[PDB]
């Protein structure tokens, strides 16, 4: 029940088309899915408390949350929103995000275990979903 690590993507299911159904146009889609925007994902948990980095060959940010803590993000496609994380049982956690400004679609995202030590991330816009799946270096 401890999501820390470097964890490296092995799987991406349905990322480029989410984008294309919120309206990302294609050019940002092509960049999103590139070899060189593949996220690496370092996690550090102590006990409700995460600190998550995400680094591409471009960029990297880093968030901090408590589990059961309003905290500040950015949606999938970037909207600035308040977002709320709770435990669904002890190797999941699921997150409902607001936006600041606007209306949007309804967002969420999940991140959980596998007894394998596979991390899965979900993230949902509405009626549409991504998967991927990470695993440790």
Excluded at 87 to 100: D, H, P, Y
Excluded at 114 to 133: F, Q, S, Y
């Amino acid at each position: 029940p401890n999501f820390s690590g470097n964890w490296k993507i092995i799987r991406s299911e349905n990322f480029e088309e989410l984008l294309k159904v919120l309206g990302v146009n294609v050019m940002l889609r092509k960049i999103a899915v590139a070899a060189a925007s593949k996220p690496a994902v370092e996690i550090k948990q102590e006990g409700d408390t995460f600190y998550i980095k995400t680094s591409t060959t471009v960029r990297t940010t880093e968030i901090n949350f408590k589990v059961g803590e309003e905290f500040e993000e950015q949606t999938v496609d970037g909207r600035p929103c308040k977002s709320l994380v709770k435990w669904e049982s002890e190797n999941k956690m699921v997150c409902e995000q607001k936006l600041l400004k606007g209306e949007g679609p309804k967002t969420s995202w999940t991140l959980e275990l596998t007894n394998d030590g596979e991390l899965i991330e979900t993230m949902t816009a509405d009626d549409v979903v991504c998967t991927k799946v990470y695993v440790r270096e």
